[PDB]
Design a protein around this nucleic acid. Sequence first.
RNA 1: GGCUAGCACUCUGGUAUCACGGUACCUUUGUGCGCC
Lengths: 183, 183
Amino acid sequence: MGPAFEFAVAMMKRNSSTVKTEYGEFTMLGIYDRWAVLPRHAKPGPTILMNDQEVGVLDAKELVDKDGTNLELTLLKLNRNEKFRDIRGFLAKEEVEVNEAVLAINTSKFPNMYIPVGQVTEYGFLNLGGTPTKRMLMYNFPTRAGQAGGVLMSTGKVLGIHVGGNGHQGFSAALLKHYFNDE
Amino acid sequence: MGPAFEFAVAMMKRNSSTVKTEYGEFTMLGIYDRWAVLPRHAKPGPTILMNDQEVGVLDAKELVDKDGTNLELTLLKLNRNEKFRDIRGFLAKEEVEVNEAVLAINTSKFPNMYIPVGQVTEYGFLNLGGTPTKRMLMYNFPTRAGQAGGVLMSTGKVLGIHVGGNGHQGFSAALLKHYFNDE
RNA sequence: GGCUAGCACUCUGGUAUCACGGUACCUUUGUGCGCC
């Protein structure tokens, strides 16, 4: 298969899981150690269902930029023995544009789905659900319910996390390297 | 949770795949190098559908004993670059009886299913579906379509591959170490 | 302690493949967890 799909299969196999909260079912990406990322709307409580197993949440941080502006991502630390593969070397300093990317989703509704989305562009500012958000990535692709959390990727690059769309376009929160320096 | 469940999760993550042949959908287990196992009834052709991707089959071996009796397993060598993790050390020399096992299945009908199995006993000779067969393991089990290929496991041990049942017991072809000797 | 009990990550070397970005397995090491 294509080198990006080869990369995407490894990423979902080693670093993704299916997560259920009070607000629905999400693809979840582990970054390193016990730190993982979710869309902000997942709003995890004291515990989450991770591959249908109850996993305690030690700490959860909703990310904002220097401006206080929403980034639409939540970092949570998981109370589990297992460590995640350290994929921070696959994360960029700043936003990345690629001519072709893959969107990978792992939920009971979209199992093992790797969707080619083509051009990804820096979109910047966006009003999601009445909330101003920054650092959004755009890709022309019809988006449906249950895709939030999908991992947007290119060979050797994890670009961001799917967080919404408008029926003809998709939007990802960019996944920057310095978000994972310490917290 | 349970150490056998931990073992089965890793086994499915690292060594299993979902296979479609002309004869239906099956769980498939990779053993070492590029060799995998299917139930004989899967009857794989020159190419296979492996996680909905077309994979050429270099060579396919139907196992019989020295007398010529059916063992209900087919070994096939895959035309792919990637090697399977070597699990030959998790296979026994002779048939194994265990008090508790897991049957692990991953098909569109039984996705990510881990079924607890009680007592597993070497039952030996059996007439499966009009065919004489040997080296069978028996365990009390519901008989349902799409379960063939399931991986019968215990912690640190791959016992065999589920190949059928009679509505009240399930049967696995025992998965012996000498079937996969380097030569 | 060992497991005929393994799991996860980390590290070190290989081998193959790759659109050279990676991927897969193997090997060295260490940490955590689990026991027979």
